[PDB]
Amino acid sequence: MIKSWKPQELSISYHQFTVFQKDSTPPVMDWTDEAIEKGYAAADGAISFEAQRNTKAFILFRLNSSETVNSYEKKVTVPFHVTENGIHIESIMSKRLSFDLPKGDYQLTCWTVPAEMSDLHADTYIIDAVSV
Amino acid sequence: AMIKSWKPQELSISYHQFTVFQKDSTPPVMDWTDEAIEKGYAAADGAISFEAQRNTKAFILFRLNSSETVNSYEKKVTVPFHVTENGIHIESIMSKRLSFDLPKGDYQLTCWTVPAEMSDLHADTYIIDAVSV
């Protein structure tokens, strides 16, 4: 089942934002040298992605997108299990975003697309959840 | 850029401070007024004392020209710092004396306060990055 959500504004702080479960508070992440180098940290049902700059950015969430991302500043792919219908995306002290992503297993690919590159003319993080 | 990292160094913090100073100098204890406290540092001569949250066995992570972002902290302080002779020390009151082979020159010295609750070392952690200028 293919789906694409409208772009959602998010204030990024501490060079990160986290994708996590609907009825859960995300755990403390272990930001090791490796985790920072890989561009993400994962723990107990959540993934924190490294963000390039602390600014109001757009989250562009997609489910099984047919569209390709031709160019990017960073590209990160991580496996992700969804326990309940819906996920949250949030940065430190930002508003909490919600997306009705179905239960199951996914490969989450996050493309960092700076304002310079983005069609939205602002730092854009494209997240495609591909049904495994 | 000349990149260099040091093994974490355990350090007993006393009087809510530790001090970065020149290889061959004896730094005084700084006047930690509400202003200096709010700033999170106090400088004098060729020495900078950084404010610590509490007196405990903390870890000092010293870095030279690191580009690794610090994703978790409760305080960030960036201060100009000149190294007179090749080498510096880090020390709290009556603690062990730490030593770091830092070349002569000017730096932008940044100190991140990472409390135990946020640190993967599970103890108050102070990350110190000397950026060459």
UniProtKB/Swiss-Prot annotation, chain A:
Localization terms from the record: Cell membrane
Keywords (A to Z) from UniProt: Cell membrane, Competence, Membrane
Cellular-component GO terms for this entry: plasma membrane
Highest taxon of the lineage: Bacteria
Membrane topology per record: Peripheral membrane protein
Keyword Membrane applies: yes
Single GO BP term: establishment of competence for transformation
InterPro entries: ComJ_sf, Competence_nuclease_inhibitor
Short name of any one Pfam family annotated for the protein: ComJ
Function: Plays a role in the competence of cells to be transformed. It inhibits the activity of the DNA-entry nuclease.
Subunit architecture: This protein is a subunit of a 75 kDa protein complex, which governs binding and entry of donor DNA. The complex is a tetramer of two subunits of the DNA-entry nuclease and two subunits of a competence-specific protein. Only the complex is able to bind ds- and ss-DNA.
Name of the protein in its database record: DNA-entry nuclease inhibitor
